[PDB]
Paper text:
Central to this ability are non‐canonical covalent intramolecular crosslinks between protein side chains forming isopeptide, thioester, and ester bonds that impart remarkable stability enhancement to single adhesin protein domains or are involved directly in covalent adhesion to host cells (Alegre‐Cebollada et al. 2010; Kang et al. 2007; Kang and Baker 2009; Kwon et al. 2014; Lei et al. 2021; Miller et al. 2018; Pointon et al. 2010; Walden et al. 2015). Two buried and protonated acids, D480 and E547, act like the oxyanion site of a serine protease, polarizing the carbonyl bond of Q580 side chain to increase its electrophilic potential and reactivity, and potentially stabilizing a high‐energy tetrahedral intermediate. In the proposed mechanism, H572 abstracts a proton from T450 Oγ1, which then effects nucleophilic attack on the Q580 Cδ with the loss of the side chain amino group as ammonia—the final state is the equivalent of the acyl‐intermediate of a serine protease mechanism, but without the potential to hydrolyze it is essentially trapped.
The T450C protein is found predominantly as non‐crosslinked and disulfide crosslinked species under non‐reducing SDS‐PAGE —this scenario is detailed below in the SEC‐MALLS and X‐ray crystallography results. Only a very small proportion of T450C protein forms the smallest hydrodynamic radius, crosslinked species eluting similarly to the wild‐type protein at ~12.5 mL and with a thioester crosslink confirmed by mass spectrometry. A close inspection of the mutation site shows no thioester crosslink with the C450 thiol group sequestered in the pocket otherwise occupied by the methyl group of the wild‐type T450. The reactive sidechain of Q580 forms hydrogen bonds through both Oε1 and Nε2 atoms with the protonated buried acid, D480. The position of E547 is unchanged compared to the wild type, pointing away from the ester bond position and making a hydrogen bond with D480. A wild‐type, non‐crosslinked model was produced from the T450C structure. In this model, the close approach (2.65 Å) of nucleophile threonine Oγ and electrophile glutamine Cδ, and the perpendicular relative orientation of the side chains, are consistent with the geometric arrangement observed by Du et al. within 1000+ serine proteases (Du et al. 2025).
Author numbering: 446 to 587
Write the structure that this text describes.
């Protein structure tokens, strides 16, 4: 299983090549942060708990949690498709960088870990990459 994720910050797409740059003017009423999640290799029609976390990337490189959202979502045909996670309006700081992490965990046991053909473990897929610019936004200075 894989999650391939792109952030939208006040309407600005992140990409692997360029963080989502939020204009100073757009930062004044906060920053609307939405994540888009393309998943593959999940179990078709199974329910997952998707947890997204918005992390402040501090000048020293460490991370601080700003917001966390959970949503009940369902894997589509052949266990691939698209989900969304809306952080809503976040009061982010001018000049600062933020990154979105995602974690998908099946509601049901979908994996046999003890060779008894009884499914006993949830499927877990994570994208927790502070160096992924597609999941990163920066609030521009004036
Ligand atoms: Ca705004
Ligand atoms: Mg088992």
């Amino acid at each position: 299983g894989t999650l391939r994720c792109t952030v939208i910050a006040d309407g600005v797409n992140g990409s692997s090549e360029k963080e989502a740059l939020v204009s100073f003017e757009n930062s004044k009423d906060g920053v609307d942060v939405k994540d888009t999640i393309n998943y593959e290799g999940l179990v078709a029609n199974q329910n997952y708990t998707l947890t997204g976390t918005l992390m402040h990337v501090k000048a020293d490189g460490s991370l601080e949690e700003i917001a966390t959202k959970t949503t009940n979502v369902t894997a589509g045909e052949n266990g691939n498709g698209t989900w969304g996670l809306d952080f809503g309006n976040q009061k982010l700081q001018v000049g600062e960088k933020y990154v979105v992490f995602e974690n998908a965990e099946s509601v049901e046991n979908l994996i046999d870990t003890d060779k008894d053909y009884n499914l006993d473990t949830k499927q877990v897929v994570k994208h927790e990459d502070k160096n992924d610019k597609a999941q990163t936004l920066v609030v521009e200075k004036p």
